[PDB]
Design a protein around this ligand. Structure first.
Ligand SMILES: CCCCCCCCCO[C@@H]1O[C@H](CO)[C@@H](O)[C@H](O)[C@H]1O
Ligand SMILES: CCCCCCCCCO[C@@H]1O[C@H](CO)[C@@H](O)[C@H](O)[C@H]1O
Length: 357
């Protein structure tokens, strides 16, 4: 009935939760491995960049496989990797485990984007919604109380319990040429990097760079959650029209918040509002892209979305890596400004292609 989709929604919740979660566990993991909080962002780069390389191949090579059998194996790789993430003894192994999840993710996102056949985005994006506001926060909380490995194991078990309802299912190019969208692919990579230079380390920035608490951090990851929620629902209303404007402004705003990271770093209420805008910004620039890809590739959407998935993660890992370099070579404070550079260019490029198309 509904329940064959509802279970899938929870699956949507849980796979995003693990993706986000290590953004507010970097310090718990740092303590454990004896490496600076910035040094562990490789595990974000590797995750994304591995899910970048394989995203097309994997969903492609598995196109033959019936959906129930598919999701099963998929979820087995996930659950096992998490056990290994919990067991992990070297940061090498931790990242080996992350790669294990990467593969699971790679496959997954395109299967459900196919299995999504605004009644799918409704039940799925509620999963992804809840994956932000509960997932990462509680994820952060459990890491504080029970240690990160335990957090990972938790997910691991969660994936198992969701699976037995998934075991109650029945058995089931020219795009490069098209330069309307390859433009949109470009804007995506550029803009994402902007966000993920700063955001990826919003914890070590909050604690180490700014006068603030570990609980203030955990407060902020919630605040970017709801801002994400607000953002999503702002995009709900005026989404079919003005969307080009709404992305361009959202990038504009994103420019703003990045540049104003240290101007806000001393006001704990400023971060509070920075995050409310920042969060709304991203969600718009996120949802403006998806929507504009679906538009610019009705033919072979899965492939469009599969490709789109991969380039976003390129941008994540790139973001994460520059964020790592700034902190490791220069200083973690300036990730704000360094972020705002791609943010500007994207805001330029956005308006260029939007006013072009
Ligand atoms: C793994 C995901 C696939 C990447 C496609 C991203 C779209 C951006 C355009 O790609 C172009 O392709 C050239 C090939 O040589 C590169 O020189 C150059 O960087 C780039 O302008
Ligand atoms: C200048 C007018 C035309 C704008 C065209 C889009 C601008 C793209 C900027 O390039 C980016 O520069 C970063 C430098 O660190 C790289 O990390 C990143 O991967 C790369 O893609």
């Amino acid at each position: 009935a509904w329940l064959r989709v509802v279970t899938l929604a929870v699956a949507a919740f849980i796979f995003n939760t693990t993706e986000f979660v290590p953004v507010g566990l970097l310090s718990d993991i740092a303590q454990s491995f004896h490496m600076q909080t910035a040094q562990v962002g490789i595990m974000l780069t590797i995750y994304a960049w591995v899910v970048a390389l394989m995203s097309l191949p994997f969903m492609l090579m598995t196109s033959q496989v019936e959906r129930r059998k598919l999701l099963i194996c998929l979820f087995v790789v996930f659950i096992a990797s998490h056990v290994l993430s919990f067991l992990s003894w070297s940061f090498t192994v931790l990242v080996i485990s992350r790669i294990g999840v990467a593969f699971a993710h790679a496959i997954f996102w395109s299967i459900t984007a196919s299995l999504a056949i605004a009644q799918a985005l409704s039940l799925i994006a509620t999963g992804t919604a809840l994956a932000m506001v509960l997932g990462l926060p509680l994820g952060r909380i459990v890491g504080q109380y029970f240690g990160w490995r335990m957090t990972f194991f938790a997910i691991g078990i969660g994936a198992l319990i969701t699976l037995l309802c998934l075991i109650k299912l029945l058995p089931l190019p020219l795009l490069f040429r098209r330069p309307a969208l390859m433009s949109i692919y470009l804007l995506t990579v550029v803009v994402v990097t902007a966000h993920y230079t700063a955001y990826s380390y919003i914890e070590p920035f909050v604690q180490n760079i700014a006068g603030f608490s570990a609980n203030f951090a955990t407060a902020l990851l919630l605040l970017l959650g709801g801002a994400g929620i607000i953002g999503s629902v702002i995009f709900g209303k005026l989404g079919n029209q003005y969307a080009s404007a709404l992305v361009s402004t959202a990038i504009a705003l994103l420019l703003v918040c990045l540049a104003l990271l240290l101007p806000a770093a001393n006001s704990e209420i400023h971060l509070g509002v920075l995050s409310i805008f920042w969060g709304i910004a991203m969600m718009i620039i996120g949802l403006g892209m998806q929507v504009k890809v679906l538009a610019l590739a009705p033919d072979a959407t899965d492939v469009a979305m599969a490709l789109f998935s991969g380039i976003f993660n390129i941008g994540i890992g790139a973001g994460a890596l520059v964020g790592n370099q700034v902190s490791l070579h220069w200083s973690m404070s300036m990730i704000g400004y360094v972020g705002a550079v791609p943010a500007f260019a994207a805001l330029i490029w956005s308006i260029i292609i939007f006013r072009r198309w």
